[PDB]
Amino acid sequence: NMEELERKANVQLERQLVMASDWSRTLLTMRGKLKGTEWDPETSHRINFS
């Protein structure tokens, strides 16, 4: 029983962590802190297929 509940708590923690990272990204992008980074980059010259 304690093993099964431990697995349940661990997968709960994983899902909590990943939505926490989602909220952290979408919150920290809006204050300009992620500006210039990969998630909020700037426009430059284009690129061809080759």
Partner: protein, 285 residues
């Protein structure tokens, strides 16, 4: 004054603390993960939060200070908490008949308002004799309301799921029952309110339309509304139980009213009741 400056400093400090608490609640992504964790029950935020407003407005009206919106909210609280909440609780999805019967109940009860506004100045209570309006013991009124709730919750419990109940040419009888109910009730109301000088003071004896079929037609129409409602979610057992309880209470009030207006009128309502013995249902009772 120095104490004014001291209190301004204290107010600034406590406002800074409160604003800091609000800000660190907001821009924390984890409170955004846990406070948006409750959007799944945004249907259940409203349906219970409005009940507190309904009961608060009910108490305010009991004191005697209710605007039109608050009393509208009182009947809305009763009617919504009746119709929509139980099937939403039992199946988790509301689509179809509960919606249209939530509309139909409000469309039903807003019929004394139009008749008592068209042939009147406004909705203000007028002056009349105290003995004209029949009263009935409060415990029986609460018992009627509680029995109506019990039958409605039992109707939602008993009836099959909203997607299993049939449609097509089986949902055309339901429309027939709805329309005939609202015709009978509106005719009864229009015939009853035409002959009364004051709000409820009957000048003469009414024996026209629904009054030449059933001696108490508004009551019968109201019960037939619940009967069609129990037919809508396909729960006949609740239909029979509301038949029992509504018949009991409504016959009690009918007896009180009938004895009053037989005393006050005499032979006219006597021969009228001889003409139409069937008191609630045509040739069933």
């Amino acid at each position: 004054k120095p104490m004014d400056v001291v209190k301004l400093t204290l107010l600034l400090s406590i406002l800074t603390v409160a604003a800091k608490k609000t800000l660190t609640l907001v821009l924390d992504p984890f409170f955004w993960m846990y406070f948006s964790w409750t959007w799944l029950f945004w249907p259940w935020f409203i349906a219970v939060g409005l009940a507190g407003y309904g009961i608060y407005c009910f108490r305010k009206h009991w004191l005697g200070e209710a605007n039109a919106f608050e009393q509208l909210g009182i009947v809305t609280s009763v009617f919504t908490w009746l119709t929509l909440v139980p099937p939403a609780y039992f199946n988790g999805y509301l689509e179809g008949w509960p919606y249209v019967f939530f509309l139909a109940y409000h469309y039903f009860f807003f019929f004394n308002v139009s008749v008592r506004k068209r042939l009147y100045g406004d909705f203000y209570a007028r002056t009349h004799d105290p003995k004209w309006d029949v009263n009935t013991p409060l415990w029986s009124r609460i018992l009627f309301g509680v029995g109506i709730m019990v039958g409605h919750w039992l109707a939602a419990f008993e009836g099959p799921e909203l997607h299993r109940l049939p449609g097509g040419w089986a949902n055309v009888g339901i429309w027939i029952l709805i329309v005939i109910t609202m015709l009978m009730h509106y005719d009864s109301t229009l015939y009853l309110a035409r002959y009364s000088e004051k709000v409820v003071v009957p000048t003469a004896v009414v024996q026209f339309g629904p009054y030449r079929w059933v001696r108490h037609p508004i009551y019968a129409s109201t019960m037939l509304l619940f009967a069609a409602y129990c037919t809508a979610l396909r729960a006949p057992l609740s239909l029979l139980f509301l038949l029992a309880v509504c018949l009991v209470y409504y016959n009690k009030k009918a007896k009180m009213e009938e004895e009053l207006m037989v005393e006050s009128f005499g032979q006219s309502y006597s021969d009228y009741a001889d003409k139409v013995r069937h008191k609630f249902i045509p040739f069933v009772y």
